[PDB]
Design a protein around this ligand. Structure first.
Ligand SMILES: CC(=O)N1CCN(c2cccc(-c3cc(-c4ccnn4CC(F)(F)F)c4c(N)ncnn34)c2)C(=O)C1(C)C
Length: 926
């Protein structure tokens, strides 16, 4: 039951075994131990209880020094119930941090040591040091840099002046100061005035019961809080927190012989014995084939097949680029006389992380080949890391041969740039071409006029890199010479060069260099794509990893979402290692945030266990019984402590304080998502814990709508959208924000009947408020009509459309996008009669209003077109995520067509109009 028998190992070699409760804190267990130890031999020899610390083997299989004795044995969760006393003394900082990391990332650091891979070890040393340094450096600076680091300003994208009554306050003081000020007032104006208002450049304003601070050179109206307060009517309640209170928070070449590879053996193969096994091999540079694909002989199907066969390639060693990858696929072929069975695949870098060409034997633990649309012999886009299941997985034994008495490395930049140095008819023939897939005759024209491309077409660098023959080192040196003198490209062009088709490390270096102009705000908008692109990297230490880490240590919000982006994929074998090494480095440099993410991951662990119970208890007792059988399981000391007082993983500046267990429920949906409510100690907020469904798809959809909202908001168009948070936290687990005062159009319609929504809106907006809500409906309708049409999100019914008490419409449960319904087809613009009605304020005909709504739809679509390449570039990088709905060229193509990307602005607007008008015509029929 509650109690558990614990083994205790005393430093005298004495052994005690007695029962204790699973909820007992370690401090309490130590006392029961000293009480029983006095009646066991060699007690006199022991030092005081406080002289010792408990040691245990945690879930992640490593020894853990259990320093915080306020932890319950249940929260410690040791492998077997074994505790060992050890002398406290040593570096009880690295011992403490290393342990917390292993728990937090859900992988023991020992797994990294076990590998005996220097690449892993060098990454760890360099990255942990860079981070540790940046953290130490962070600690040096004063309150202004720190408040900028931990609580970065949450501002509106960006106008009149208005009267604003603002309720000021002070630290500890329960005495308010309702002082009114100008909409365009700087922070000091709202500050020192209230300091002068109390008496008759120190401190900053803080939003009550939030980690949101008002500071810096900006007008009040430009701050999300003030801004939302103005719109929702409500008066902003600030607090003056002194500098003292903030500080308290603060504390050579030659080899002209061919490329040779010795396919020695295969291992643990699981194929039909009737068949024959073949190993197909190719050489690649990104997506491009570096030469013809050599194949092995057929050998009979067995577990350990032997080939001991030499494979030569139509590429001479000195021609192999830095990023050359050897790709393998094992096939089960029906011996020569209807489909060739793809067994497994494996990719390998021809050069190591230190520029040295790999020699000797290699045992490549292989990944299963997934049967798909692109049959493809090989998988060059696949990961270069070995299948971590070295245990039960198939493998291939290869041997790259020695080719010199001394090891050979790829040339240095100086020896590359050395070799690299050095008409009006064709000048037109370059303009016509540079105005995606260039034809081989056009390719050579671009390469010949490559200096003309650098001089007059710098934005066509991507086009130039793809025409380059990466299988001829002469051609590579030439390109690289121009690269090292190329003008800095805009963020938009740089985003394109992050994709798998640009594997050269010099390319990646240029791409990051141009991405260094990004404000924390715009960076946050691409963060998900940038994390995804790490899956296309060849080596652990790369420019993108370093960039992503620099940014995360410079901004806390970025660091937080970078943590969850990597954390939520710690289950995927392909990324576990890479992501794990980034998370350790991030943690080492963000020890403060480590404490927050620890609290969050803990509550998350409880919710998975709580949800798991409810899921089961649904297939037993009825819903109100389960509800009450959930409230007792929640009110357990440990459950309630873990679920209380934490920063929200969805928005770390939101303080989820006291759980309202009475208000906590679950949803009658498939995966039974938990409805968890909280109340404000100083400032309501709720979270939805869903486990079972993949949330990546929904987060990308929501991120894009938010991007659209920012792009629209930037050009003075506020379409009153609801960018509710959705965050994947783990394996088929995530959180979804609670939008209070909202209901699904199906539920609203069942409580005239054509006026069912208008009555609901009337019952939530009386008199003067009715006209406000319809403008909220009109504005949100347009935005979501345009959004869902552009993204190809179909199946838009009343169970997946929601209305807010303010009048704002918004979409939920985006199951599929890009025309997919399983089967991708062009989703038309959809005008719903029910909505068209509310827009017309109840009338049959009201073009006065309806045409204004037409304008919102039309300008929303027009703005999206202006940023069409952004969405294509972003979506093209998302192909690294491996979502079925976003796996190829035709998925990204959807966007080109939806946004009429090809067609002129006028040609696009007239087709949008035709589609709009027919959505209104077909609206009537439904
Ligand atoms: C108080 C209470 O116990 N309620 C009332 C809310 N409710 C309900 C109904 C219809 C839609 C949504 C719903 C779905 C989503 C939603 C948005 C995106 N995905 N989802 C569903 C998901 F959370 F499961 F993912 C959201 C949301 N973000 N905020 C508020 N309600 N809400 C909730 C309920 O079933 C119960 C559980 C009966």
């Amino acid at each position: 039951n509650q109690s558990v028998v614990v083994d205790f190992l005393l430093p005298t070699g004495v052994y005690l075994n007695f029962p204790v409760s699973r909820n007992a804190n370690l401090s309490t267990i130590k006392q029961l131990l000293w009480h029983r130890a006095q009646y066991e031999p060699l007690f006199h020899m022991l030092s005081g209880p406080e002289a010792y610390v408990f040691t245990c083997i945690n879930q992640t299989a490593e020894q853990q020094e259990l320093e915080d004795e306020q932890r319950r044995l249940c929260d410690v969760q040791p492998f077997l119930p074994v505790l060992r006393l050890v002398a406290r003394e040593g570096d009880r900082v690295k011992k403490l941090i290393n342990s917390q990391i292993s728990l937090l990332i859900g992988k023991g650091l020992h797994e990294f040591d076990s590998l005996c891979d220097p690449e892993v070890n060098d990454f760890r040393a360099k990255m942990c040091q860079f981070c540790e340094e940046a953290a130490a450096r962070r600690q040096q600076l004063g309150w202004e840099a720190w408040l900028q680091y931990s609580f970065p300003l949450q501002l509106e994208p960006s106008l009149p002046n208005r009267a604003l009554l603002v309720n000021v306050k002070f630290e500890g003081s329960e005495e308010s100061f309702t002082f009114q000020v100008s909409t365009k007032d700087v922070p000091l104006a709202l500050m020192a005035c209230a300091l002068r208002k109390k008496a008759t450049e120190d401190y900053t304003l803080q939003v009550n019961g939030r980690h949101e601070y008002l500071y810096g050179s900006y007008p009040l109206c430009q701050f999300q809080y003030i801004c939302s307060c103005l719109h929702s009517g409500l008066t902003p309640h600030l607090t003056m927190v002194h500098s003292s209170s903030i500080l308290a928070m603060r504390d050579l070449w030659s080899l002209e012989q061919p490329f040779r590879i010795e396919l020695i053996q295969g291992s643990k193969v699981n194929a039909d014995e009737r068949m024959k096994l073949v190993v197909q091999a190719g050489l690649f540079h990104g997506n491009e084939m570096l030469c013809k694909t050599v194949s092995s002989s057929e050998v009979s199907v067995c577990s350990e097949p032997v080939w001991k066969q030499r494979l030569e390639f139509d590429i001479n060693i000195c021609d192999l680029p830095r990023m050359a990858r050897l790709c393998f696929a094992l096939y089960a072929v029906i011996e020569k006389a209807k489909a060739d069975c793809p067994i497994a695949w494996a990719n390998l870098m021809l050069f190591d992380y230190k520029d040295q060409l790999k020699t000797g034997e290699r045992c490549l633990y292989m990944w299963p080949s997934v049967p798909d649309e692109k049959g493809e012999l090989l998988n060059p886009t696949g990961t270069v890391r070995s299948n971590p299941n070295t245990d039960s997985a198939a493998a291939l034994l290869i041997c790259l041969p020695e080719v010199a008495p001394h090891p050979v490395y790829y040339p240095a930049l100086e020896k590359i740039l050395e070799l690299g140095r050095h008409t009006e008819e064709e000048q037109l023939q370059l303009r016509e071409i540079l105005e995606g897939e260039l034809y081989e005759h056009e390719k050579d024209l671009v390469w010949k006029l490559r200096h003309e491309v650098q001089e007059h077409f710098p934005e066509a660098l991507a086009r130039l890199l793809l025409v380059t023959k990466w299988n001829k080192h002469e051609d590579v040196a030439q390109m690289l010479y121009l690269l090292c003198s190329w003008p800095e490209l805009p963020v938009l062009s740089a985003l394109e060069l992050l994709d798998f088709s640009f594997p050269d490390c010099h390319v990646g270096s240029f791409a990051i260099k141009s991405l260094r102009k990004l404000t924390d705000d715009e960076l946050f908008q691409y963060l998900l794509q940038l994390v995804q692109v790490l899956k296309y990297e060849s080596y652990l230490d790369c420019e993108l990893t370093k960039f992503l880490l620099d940014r995360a240590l410079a901004n806390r919000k970025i660091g937080h979402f970078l943590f969850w982006h990597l954390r939520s994929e710690m289950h995927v074998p392909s990324v576990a290692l890479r992501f794990g090494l980034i998370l350790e480095a991030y943690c080492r440099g963000s020890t403060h945030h480590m404490k927050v993410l620890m609290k969050q991951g803990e509550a998350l662990s409880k919710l998975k266990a709580l949800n798991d119970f409810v899921k089961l208890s649904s297939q037993k007792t009825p819903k109100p019984q389960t509800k009450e059988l959930m409230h007792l399981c929640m009110r357990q000391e440990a459950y309630l402590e873990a679920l209380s007082h934490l920063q929200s993983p969805l928005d770390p500046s939101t303080l989820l304080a006291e759980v309202c267990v009475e208000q906590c429920t679950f949803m009658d949906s498939k995966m039974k998502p938990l409805w968890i409510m909280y109340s404000n100690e100083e400032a309501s907020v709720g979270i939805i814990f869903k486990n079972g469904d993949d949330l990546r798809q929904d987060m990308l959809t929501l991120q894009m709508i938010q991007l659209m909202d920012v792009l629209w908001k930037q050009e003075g168009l506020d379409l009153r959208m609801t960018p509710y948070g959705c965050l994947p936290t783990g394996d088929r687990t995530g959180l979804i924000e609670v939008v209070l005062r909202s209901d699904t159009i199906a539920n609203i319609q069942l409580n005239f009947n054509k006026d069912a929504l208008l009555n609901w809106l009337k019952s939530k907006n009386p008199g003067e408020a009715l006209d406000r809500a319809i403008e909220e409906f009109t504005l949100s309708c347009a935005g979501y009509c345009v959004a869902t049409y552009v993204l190809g999100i179909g199946d838009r019914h009343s169970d997946n459309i929601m209305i807010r008490e303010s009048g704002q419409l918004f979409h939920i449960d985006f199951g599929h996008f890009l025309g997919n319904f399983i089967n991708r087809e062009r989703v038309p613009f959809i005008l719903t009669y029910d909505f068209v009605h509310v827009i017309q304020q109840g009338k049959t005909n009201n073009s006065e209003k309806f045409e204004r709504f037409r304008g919102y739809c039309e300008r929303a679509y027009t703005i999206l077109r202006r940023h069409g390449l952004l969405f294509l570039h972003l979506f093209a990088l998302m192909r690294a995520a491996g979502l079925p709905e976003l796996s190829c060229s035709k998925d990204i193509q959807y966007l080109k067509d939806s946004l009429a990307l090809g067609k002129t602005e006028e040609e696009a607007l007239k087709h949008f109009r035709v589609k709009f008008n027919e959505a209104l015509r077909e609206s009537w029929k439904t």
